Amino acid sequence: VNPTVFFDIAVDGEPLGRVSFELFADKVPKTAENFRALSTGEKGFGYKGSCFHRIIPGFMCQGGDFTRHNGTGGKSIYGEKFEDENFILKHTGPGILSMANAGPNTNGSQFFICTAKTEWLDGKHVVFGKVKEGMNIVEAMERFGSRNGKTSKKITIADCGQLE
């Protein structure tokens, strides 16, 4: 209805588990569709096989750079960047899915999953989804991150697609 997408996560090739996300297409349609389409890979590029390049324990897990795998790339289905759609939703707690960016109106494909309430990001990053199942898998991923965001194991989206 509002779409659900999943990520199957692997840690150095070993299966960790599945996280699914509800995308708020009712409130942020353009942003939610970009993520949905990048998860199915239906426009010919997307998240399958990419990694979480920056994980900071107690704060958030960030990924979505499928072109340079380090936070300097990625692209949306609308072009290299697109505008901040609205800031209706807030970073209210663990499980919030929001867009990473490089300043106002620079949304591409990078996203982060909050593991804490991060109110200082409200009005700066567009919130568009939430973890539906597998929050415990995000908590497990979190243990491989560090204070500067570097991960001690390669965390990858082994598979991903739509469920609902």
Coordinates of N, CA, C and O in Angstrom, one line a residue:
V1 N 1.0 -1.1 0.0 CA 0.0 0.0 0.0 C 1.0 1.2 0.0 O 1.4 1.5 -1.1
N2 N 1.4 1.7 1.1 CA 2.7 2.5 1.2 C 3.7 1.3 0.9 O 3.5 0.2 1.5
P3 N 4.6 1.4 0.0 CA 5.5 0.2 -0.4 C 6.4 -0.3 0.7 O 6.8 0.5 1.6
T4 N 6.7 -1.6 0.7 CA 7.7 -2.1 1.6 C 8.9 -2.7 0.8 O 8.6 -3.4 -0.1
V5 N 10.1 -2.3 1.2 CA 11.2 -2.9 0.5 C 12.1 -3.6 1.5 O 12.0 -3.4 2.7
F6 N 12.9 -4.6 1.1 CA 13.8 -5.3 2.0 C 15.2 -5.2 1.5 O 15.5 -5.0 0.3
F7 N 16.1 -5.4 2.5 CA 17.6 -5.5 2.2 C 18.0 -6.8 2.9 O 17.6 -7.0 4.1
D8 N 18.7 -7.7 2.3 CA 19.3 -8.8 2.9 C 20.8 -8.4 3.1 O 21.5 -8.1 2.1
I9 N 21.2 -8.4 4.3 CA 22.5 -7.9 4.7 C 23.5 -9.0 4.8 O 23.2 -10.0 5.4
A10 N 24.8 -8.8 4.4 CA 25.9 -9.7 4.6 C 27.0 -9.0 5.2 O 27.2 -7.8 4.9
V11 N 27.8 -9.7 6.0 CA 29.0 -9.1 6.7 C 30.1 -10.0 6.2 O 30.1 -11.2 6.5
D12 N 31.0 -9.4 5.4 CA 32.1 -10.2 4.8 C 31.6 -11.4 4.0 O 32.2 -12.5 4.1
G13 N 30.5 -11.3 3.3 CA 30.0 -12.5 2.6 C 29.1 -13.3 3.4 O 28.2 -14.0 2.9
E14 N 29.2 -13.4 4.8 CA 28.3 -14.2 5.6 C 26.9 -13.5 5.8 O 26.9 -12.4 6.2
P15 N 25.8 -14.2 5.6 CA 24.5 -13.7 5.8 C 24.2 -13.2 7.2 O 24.6 -13.9 8.2
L16 N 23.7 -12.0 7.4 CA 23.4 -11.5 8.7 C 21.9 -11.6 8.9 O 21.5 -12.2 9.9
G17 N 21.1 -11.1 8.0 CA 19.7 -11.1 8.1 C 19.0 -10.1 7.2 O 19.7 -9.4 6.4
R18 N 17.7 -9.9 7.3 CA 16.9 -9.1 6.5 C 16.3 -7.9 7.3 O 15.8 -8.1 8.4
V19 N 16.3 -6.7 6.7 CA 15.7 -5.5 7.3 C 14.6 -5.1 6.3 O 14.9 -5.1 5.1
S20 N 13.4 -4.8 6.6 CA 12.4 -4.4 5.7 C 12.0 -2.9 6.1 O 12.2 -2.6 7.3
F21 N 11.6 -2.1 5.1 CA 11.3 -0.7 5.4 C 10.0 -0.3 4.8 O 9.6 -0.8 3.7
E22 N 9.2 0.4 5.6 CA 8.0 1.0 5.0 C 8.4 2.4 4.4 O 9.1 3.2 5.1
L23 N 8.0 2.7 3.2 CA 8.4 4.0 2.6 C 7.1 4.8 2.6 O 6.1 4.4 2.1
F24 N 7.2 6.0 3.1 CA 6.1 6.9 3.2 C 5.8 7.7 1.9 O 5.9 8.9 1.8
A25 N 5.4 6.9 0.8 CA 5.1 7.5 -0.5 C 3.9 8.4 -0.4 O 3.7 9.3 -1.2
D26 N 3.0 8.2 0.6 CA 1.9 9.1 0.9 C 2.4 10.5 1.3 O 1.9 11.5 0.8
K27 N 3.4 10.6 2.1 CA 4.0 11.9 2.5 C 5.1 12.5 1.7 O 5.2 13.7 1.4
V28 N 6.0 11.6 1.2 CA 7.2 12.1 0.4 C 7.3 11.2 -0.9 O 8.2 10.5 -1.1
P29 N 6.3 11.3 -1.8 CA 6.3 10.5 -3.0 C 7.5 10.4 -3.8 O 7.9 9.3 -4.2
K30 N 8.1 11.6 -4.2 CA 9.3 11.6 -5.1 C 10.5 10.9 -4.4 O 11.2 10.1 -5.1
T31 N 10.7 11.2 -3.1 CA 11.9 10.6 -2.4 C 11.7 9.1 -2.2 O 12.6 8.3 -2.4
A32 N 10.4 8.7 -1.8 CA 10.2 7.3 -1.6 C 10.3 6.5 -2.9 O 10.9 5.4 -2.9
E33 N 9.8 7.0 -4.0 CA 9.9 6.3 -5.3 C 11.4 6.1 -5.7 O 11.7 5.1 -6.2
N34 N 12.2 7.1 -5.5 CA 13.7 7.0 -5.8 C 14.3 5.8 -5.1 O 14.8 4.9 -5.7
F35 N 14.0 5.7 -3.8 CA 14.5 4.6 -3.0 C 13.9 3.3 -3.4 O 14.6 2.3 -3.6
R36 N 12.6 3.2 -3.7 CA 11.9 2.0 -4.1 C 12.5 1.5 -5.4 O 12.9 0.3 -5.5
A37 N 12.7 2.4 -6.4 CA 13.2 2.0 -7.7 C 14.7 1.6 -7.6 O 15.2 0.7 -8.3
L38 N 15.5 2.2 -6.7 CA 16.9 1.8 -6.5 C 17.0 0.5 -5.8 O 18.0 -0.2 -6.1
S39 N 16.0 0.1 -5.0 CA 15.9 -1.2 -4.4 C 15.5 -2.3 -5.3 O 15.9 -3.5 -5.1
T40 N 14.7 -2.1 -6.3 CA 14.3 -3.1 -7.3 C 15.4 -3.2 -8.4 O 15.5 -4.2 -9.1
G41 N 16.1 -2.1 -8.6 CA 17.0 -2.0 -9.7 C 16.3 -1.9 -11.1 O 17.0 -2.0 -12.1
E42 N 15.0 -1.6 -11.0 CA 14.3 -1.5 -12.3 C 14.7 -0.5 -13.3 O 14.4 -0.6 -14.5
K43 N 15.4 0.6 -13.0 CA 15.9 1.5 -14.0 C 17.3 1.1 -14.5 O 17.9 1.8 -15.2
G44 N 17.8 -0.1 -14.1 CA 19.0 -0.5 -14.6 C 20.2 -0.2 -13.7 O 21.3 -0.5 -14.0
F45 N 20.0 0.3 -12.5 CA 21.1 0.5 -11.5 C 20.4 0.6 -10.2 O 19.2 0.8 -10.1
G46 N 21.2 0.5 -9.1 CA 20.6 0.5 -7.8 C 21.4 -0.1 -6.7 O 22.7 -0.2 -6.9
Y47 N 20.8 -0.5 -5.6 CA 21.5 -0.8 -4.4 C 22.1 -2.2 -4.3 O 22.9 -2.5 -3.5
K48 N 21.6 -3.2 -5.1 CA 22.1 -4.6 -4.9 C 23.6 -4.7 -5.1 O 24.1 -4.2 -6.1
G49 N 24.2 -5.2 -4.1 CA 25.7 -5.4 -4.1 C 26.4 -4.3 -3.4 O 27.6 -4.4 -3.2
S50 N 25.8 -3.1 -3.1 CA 26.5 -2.0 -2.6 C 26.8 -2.2 -1.1 O 26.2 -3.1 -0.4
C51 N 27.6 -1.3 -0.5 CA 27.9 -1.4 0.9 C 27.5 -0.3 1.8 O 27.2 0.8 1.3
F52 N 27.5 -0.5 3.1 CA 27.3 0.5 4.1 C 28.7 1.0 4.4 O 29.5 0.4 4.9
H53 N 29.0 2.3 3.9 CA 30.3 2.8 4.0 C 30.6 3.5 5.3 O 31.8 3.7 5.7
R54 N 29.6 3.9 6.1 CA 29.8 4.8 7.3 C 28.8 4.4 8.3 O 27.6 4.6 8.2
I55 N 29.3 3.8 9.4 CA 28.4 3.4 10.5 C 29.0 3.9 11.8 O 30.1 3.7 12.1
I56 N 28.2 4.7 12.5 CA 28.6 5.4 13.7 C 27.7 4.9 14.8 O 26.5 5.2 14.8
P57 N 28.2 4.0 15.7 CA 27.4 3.4 16.7 C 26.7 4.4 17.6 O 27.3 5.4 18.0
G58 N 25.5 4.1 17.9 CA 24.6 5.0 18.7 C 24.0 6.1 17.9 O 23.3 6.9 18.5
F59 N 24.4 6.3 16.7 CA 23.9 7.4 15.9 C 23.2 6.9 14.6 O 22.0 7.0 14.5
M60 N 23.9 6.3 13.6 CA 23.3 5.9 12.4 C 24.1 5.0 11.5 O 25.4 5.0 11.7
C61 N 23.5 4.3 10.6 CA 24.2 3.4 9.6 C 23.9 4.0 8.2 O 22.8 4.2 7.9
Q62 N 25.0 4.3 7.4 CA 24.8 5.0 6.2 C 25.3 4.2 5.0 O 26.4 3.6 5.0
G63 N 24.6 4.2 3.9 CA 25.0 3.4 2.7 C 24.4 4.1 1.5 O 24.1 5.3 1.5
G64 N 24.3 3.4 0.3 CA 23.6 3.9 -0.9 C 24.6 4.5 -1.9 O 24.1 4.9 -3.0
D65 N 25.9 4.5 -1.7 CA 26.8 4.9 -2.7 C 27.3 3.7 -3.5 O 28.3 3.1 -3.3
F66 N 26.4 3.4 -4.5 CA 26.7 2.3 -5.4 C 27.7 2.6 -6.5 O 28.0 1.8 -7.4
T67 N 28.2 3.8 -6.6 CA 29.2 4.1 -7.7 C 30.6 4.2 -7.2 O 31.5 3.7 -7.9
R68 N 30.9 4.8 -6.1 CA 32.2 4.9 -5.6 C 32.5 4.2 -4.3 O 33.6 4.1 -3.8
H69 N 31.4 3.7 -3.6 CA 31.4 2.8 -2.5 C 32.1 3.4 -1.3 O 32.5 2.7 -0.3
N70 N 32.1 4.8 -1.2 CA 32.8 5.4 -0.1 C 32.2 6.7 0.4 O 32.7 7.4 1.2
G71 N 31.0 7.0 -0.1 CA 30.3 8.3 0.3 C 30.6 9.4 -0.7 O 29.9 10.4 -0.5
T72 N 31.4 9.2 -1.7 CA 31.5 10.3 -2.7 C 30.7 10.2 -3.9 O 30.7 11.1 -4.8
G73 N 29.9 9.1 -4.1 CA 29.1 9.0 -5.3 C 27.6 8.6 -5.0 O 27.0 9.0 -4.0
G74 N 27.1 7.9 -6.0 CA 25.7 7.5 -6.0 C 24.9 8.5 -7.0 O 25.5 9.5 -7.4
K75 N 23.7 8.2 -7.4 CA 22.9 9.1 -8.2 C 21.5 8.7 -8.0 O 21.2 7.5 -7.7
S76 N 20.5 9.6 -8.3 CA 19.1 9.3 -8.1 C 18.6 8.8 -9.5 O 19.2 8.9 -10.5
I77 N 17.3 8.3 -9.5 CA 16.7 8.0 -10.7 C 16.3 9.2 -11.5 O 15.8 9.1 -12.7
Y78 N 16.4 10.4 -10.9 CA 16.0 11.7 -11.5 C 17.3 12.4 -12.0 O 17.2 13.6 -12.5
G79 N 18.5 11.9 -11.9 CA 19.7 12.6 -12.3 C 20.7 12.5 -11.2 O 20.4 11.8 -10.2
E80 N 21.8 13.3 -11.3 CA 22.7 13.1 -10.2 C 22.3 13.6 -8.8 O 22.6 13.0 -7.8
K81 N 21.4 14.6 -8.8 CA 20.9 15.1 -7.5 C 19.4 15.6 -7.7 O 19.0 15.9 -8.9
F82 N 18.6 15.7 -6.7 CA 17.3 16.3 -6.8 C 17.1 17.0 -5.4 O 17.8 16.9 -4.4
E83 N 16.1 17.9 -5.4 CA 15.7 18.8 -4.3 C 15.2 18.1 -3.1 O 14.7 16.9 -3.1
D84 N 15.2 18.8 -2.0 CA 14.6 18.4 -0.8 C 13.1 18.6 -1.0 O 12.6 19.7 -1.3
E85 N 12.4 17.5 -0.9 CA 11.0 17.4 -1.2 C 10.1 18.1 -0.2 O 9.3 18.9 -0.6
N86 N 10.3 17.9 1.1 CA 9.6 18.6 2.2 C 10.3 18.1 3.4 O 11.1 17.2 3.4
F87 N 10.0 18.7 4.6 CA 10.6 18.3 5.8 C 9.5 18.0 6.9 O 9.6 18.3 8.1
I88 N 8.4 17.5 6.4 CA 7.2 17.2 7.2 C 7.5 16.2 8.3 O 7.2 16.3 9.5
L89 N 8.3 15.1 8.0 CA 8.6 14.1 9.0 C 9.9 14.4 9.7 O 10.8 15.1 9.2
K90 N 9.9 14.0 11.0 CA 11.1 14.3 11.8 C 11.8 13.0 12.2 O 11.4 11.9 12.0
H91 N 13.1 13.2 12.8 CA 13.9 12.1 13.2 C 13.6 11.8 14.6 O 14.2 12.2 15.6
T92 N 12.5 11.0 14.8 CA 11.9 10.8 16.1 C 12.5 9.7 16.9 O 12.2 9.6 18.1
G93 N 13.4 8.8 16.4 CA 13.9 7.7 17.1 C 14.6 6.7 16.2 O 14.8 6.9 15.0
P94 N 15.1 5.6 16.8 CA 15.7 4.5 16.1 C 14.8 4.0 15.0 O 13.6 3.9 15.2
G95 N 15.3 3.5 13.8 CA 14.5 3.0 12.8 C 14.1 4.0 11.6 O 13.7 3.5 10.6
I96 N 14.3 5.3 11.9 CA 14.0 6.3 10.9 C 15.0 6.2 9.7 O 16.2 6.1 9.9
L97 N 14.4 6.2 8.5 CA 15.2 6.2 7.3 C 15.1 7.6 6.6 O 14.1 8.2 6.4
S98 N 16.3 8.2 6.4 CA 16.4 9.5 5.9 C 17.5 9.6 4.9 O 18.4 8.8 4.8
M99 N 17.4 10.7 4.1 CA 18.4 11.0 3.0 C 19.6 11.7 3.5 O 19.6 12.7 4.1
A100 N 20.8 11.1 3.1 CA 22.1 11.7 3.4 C 22.2 12.8 2.3 O 21.7 12.6 1.2
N101 N 23.0 13.8 2.5 CA 23.2 14.9 1.5 C 24.5 15.6 1.7 O 25.2 15.4 2.7
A102 N 24.8 16.5 0.7 CA 25.9 17.4 0.8 C 25.5 18.8 0.8 O 26.2 19.7 0.3
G103 N 24.4 19.1 1.5 CA 23.9 20.5 1.5 C 22.5 20.6 1.0 O 21.9 19.5 0.7
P104 N 21.9 21.7 0.9 CA 20.5 21.9 0.5 C 20.3 21.3 -0.9 O 21.1 21.6 -1.7
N105 N 19.2 20.6 -1.1 CA 18.8 20.1 -2.5 C 19.9 19.4 -3.2 O 20.1 19.6 -4.5
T106 N 20.6 18.5 -2.6 CA 21.7 17.6 -3.2 C 21.4 16.1 -2.9 O 22.3 15.3 -2.7
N107 N 20.1 15.7 -2.9 CA 19.8 14.3 -2.7 C 20.2 13.5 -3.9 O 19.9 13.8 -5.0
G108 N 20.8 12.3 -3.6 CA 21.2 11.4 -4.7 C 20.7 10.0 -4.3 O 19.5 9.8 -4.4
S109 N 21.5 9.1 -3.9 CA 21.1 7.8 -3.5 C 21.5 7.4 -2.1 O 21.1 6.4 -1.6
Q110 N 22.3 8.2 -1.4 CA 22.8 7.8 -0.1 C 21.7 8.1 0.9 O 21.0 9.1 0.8
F111 N 21.6 7.3 1.9 CA 20.6 7.3 2.9 C 21.2 6.8 4.3 O 22.3 6.2 4.2
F112 N 20.6 7.0 5.4 CA 21.0 6.5 6.6 C 19.8 6.0 7.4 O 18.7 6.5 7.2
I113 N 20.1 5.1 8.3 CA 19.1 4.5 9.2 C 19.5 5.0 10.6 O 20.6 4.7 11.0
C114 N 18.7 5.7 11.2 CA 19.0 6.2 12.6 C 18.9 5.1 13.6 O 18.0 4.2 13.6
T115 N 19.8 5.0 14.6 CA 19.7 4.1 15.7 C 19.4 4.8 16.9 O 19.3 4.2 18.0
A116 N 19.1 6.1 16.9 CA 18.8 7.0 18.0 C 17.9 8.1 17.5 O 17.7 8.3 16.3
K117 N 17.3 8.8 18.4 CA 16.5 10.0 18.1 C 17.6 11.1 17.7 O 18.5 11.3 18.4
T118 N 17.5 11.7 16.5 CA 18.5 12.6 16.1 C 17.9 13.9 15.6 O 17.9 14.3 14.5
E119 N 17.2 14.6 16.6 CA 16.5 15.8 16.3 C 17.3 16.9 15.7 O 16.8 17.7 14.9
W120 N 18.6 17.0 15.9 CA 19.4 18.0 15.3 C 19.5 17.9 13.8 O 20.0 18.8 13.1
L121 N 19.0 16.8 13.2 CA 19.0 16.7 11.7 C 17.7 17.1 11.1 O 17.6 17.2 9.9
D122 N 16.6 17.4 11.9 CA 15.4 17.8 11.4 C 15.5 19.1 10.6 O 16.2 20.1 10.9
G123 N 14.8 19.1 9.5 CA 14.9 20.3 8.6 C 16.2 20.4 7.8 O 16.3 21.3 7.0
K124 N 17.1 19.4 8.0 CA 18.3 19.4 7.2 C 18.3 18.1 6.3 O 18.9 18.1 5.2
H125 N 17.7 17.0 6.7 CA 17.7 15.8 5.9 C 16.2 15.3 5.8 O 15.4 15.4 6.7
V126 N 15.8 14.9 4.6 CA 14.5 14.5 4.3 C 14.2 13.0 4.8 O 14.8 12.1 4.3
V127 N 13.3 12.9 5.7 CA 12.9 11.6 6.3 C 11.8 11.0 5.4 O 10.9 11.8 5.0
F128 N 11.9 9.8 5.0 CA 11.0 9.2 4.0 C 10.6 7.7 4.3 O 9.8 7.2 3.5
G129 N 11.0 7.1 5.4 CA 10.7 5.7 5.7 C 11.0 5.4 7.1 O 11.5 6.2 7.9
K130 N 10.8 4.1 7.5 CA 11.1 3.6 8.8 C 11.3 2.0 8.7 O 10.7 1.4 7.8
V131 N 12.1 1.4 9.5 CA 12.3 0.0 9.6 C 11.0 -0.6 10.1 O 10.3 -0.1 11.0
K132 N 10.5 -1.6 9.4 CA 9.3 -2.3 9.6 C 9.7 -3.6 10.4 O 9.3 -3.9 11.5
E133 N 10.6 -4.4 9.9 CA 11.1 -5.6 10.6 C 12.6 -5.6 10.5 O 13.2 -5.0 9.6
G134 N 13.3 -6.3 11.5 CA 14.7 -6.4 11.4 C 15.5 -5.3 12.0 O 16.7 -5.1 11.7
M135 N 14.9 -4.5 13.0 CA 15.6 -3.5 13.7 C 16.8 -4.1 14.4 O 17.9 -3.5 14.5
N136 N 16.7 -5.3 14.9 CA 17.7 -6.1 15.6 C 18.8 -6.3 14.6 O 20.0 -6.4 15.1
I137 N 18.6 -6.5 13.3 CA 19.7 -6.7 12.3 C 20.4 -5.3 12.2 O 21.6 -5.3 12.1
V138 N 19.7 -4.2 12.2 CA 20.4 -2.9 12.1 C 21.3 -2.7 13.4 O 22.5 -2.4 13.3
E139 N 20.8 -3.1 14.6 CA 21.6 -3.0 15.8 C 22.8 -3.9 15.7 O 23.9 -3.5 16.2
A140 N 22.7 -5.1 15.1 CA 23.9 -6.0 14.9 C 24.9 -5.3 13.9 O 26.1 -5.5 14.2
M141 N 24.5 -4.7 12.9 CA 25.3 -4.0 11.9 C 26.2 -2.9 12.6 O 27.4 -2.7 12.3
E142 N 25.5 -2.2 13.4 CA 26.0 -1.1 14.2 C 27.3 -1.4 15.0 O 28.2 -0.6 15.1
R143 N 27.4 -2.7 15.4 CA 28.6 -3.1 16.1 C 29.8 -3.1 15.3 O 30.9 -3.3 15.8
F144 N 29.7 -3.0 13.9 CA 30.9 -3.1 13.1 C 31.4 -1.7 12.7 O 32.3 -1.5 11.9
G145 N 30.7 -0.6 13.2 CA 31.1 0.7 12.9 C 32.1 1.3 13.9 O 32.6 0.6 14.8
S146 N 32.4 2.6 13.9 CA 33.3 3.2 14.8 C 33.1 4.7 14.9 O 32.2 5.2 14.2
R147 N 33.8 5.4 15.8 CA 33.6 6.8 16.0 C 33.8 7.7 14.8 O 33.0 8.6 14.5
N148 N 34.7 7.3 13.9 CA 34.8 8.1 12.6 C 34.0 7.5 11.5 O 34.1 7.8 10.3
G149 N 33.2 6.4 11.8 CA 32.3 5.8 10.7 C 33.0 4.7 9.9 O 32.2 4.0 9.2
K150 N 34.3 4.4 10.1 CA 34.9 3.3 9.3 C 34.4 2.0 9.9 O 34.4 1.8 11.1
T151 N 34.1 1.0 9.0 CA 33.6 -0.3 9.5 C 34.7 -1.3 9.6 O 35.7 -1.2 8.9
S152 N 34.7 -2.2 10.5 CA 35.7 -3.2 10.6 C 35.5 -4.4 9.7 O 36.4 -5.3 9.6
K153 N 34.3 -4.6 9.2 CA 34.0 -5.7 8.3 C 33.2 -5.0 7.1 O 32.7 -3.9 7.3
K154 N 33.2 -5.6 5.9 CA 32.5 -5.1 4.8 C 31.0 -5.5 4.9 O 30.6 -6.7 5.0
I155 N 30.1 -4.5 5.1 CA 28.7 -4.7 5.3 C 28.0 -4.5 3.9 O 28.2 -3.4 3.4
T156 N 27.4 -5.5 3.3 CA 26.8 -5.3 2.0 C 25.3 -5.7 1.9 O 24.8 -6.4 2.7
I157 N 24.7 -5.1 0.9 CA 23.3 -5.4 0.6 C 23.4 -6.5 -0.4 O 23.6 -6.3 -1.6
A158 N 23.4 -7.7 0.1 CA 23.5 -8.9 -0.7 C 22.4 -9.1 -1.7 O 22.5 -9.5 -2.8
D159 N 21.2 -8.7 -1.3 CA 20.0 -8.7 -2.2 C 19.0 -7.7 -1.7 O 19.1 -7.3 -0.5
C160 N 18.1 -7.2 -2.5 CA 17.1 -6.2 -2.1 C 16.0 -6.2 -3.1 O 16.2 -6.6 -4.3
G161 N 14.8 -5.7 -2.8 CA 13.8 -5.6 -3.7 C 12.5 -5.2 -3.0 O 12.6 -4.8 -1.8
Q162 N 11.4 -5.3 -3.6 CA 10.1 -4.9 -3.0 C 9.3 -6.1 -2.5 O 9.4 -7.2 -3.0
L163 N 8.6 -5.9 -1.3 CA 7.8 -6.8 -0.7 C 6.3 -6.4 -0.8 O 5.5 -7.3 -1.0
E164 N 5.9 -5.1 -0.8 CA 4.6 -4.6 -0.7 C 4.5 -3.2 -1.3 O 3.4 -2.6 -1.5

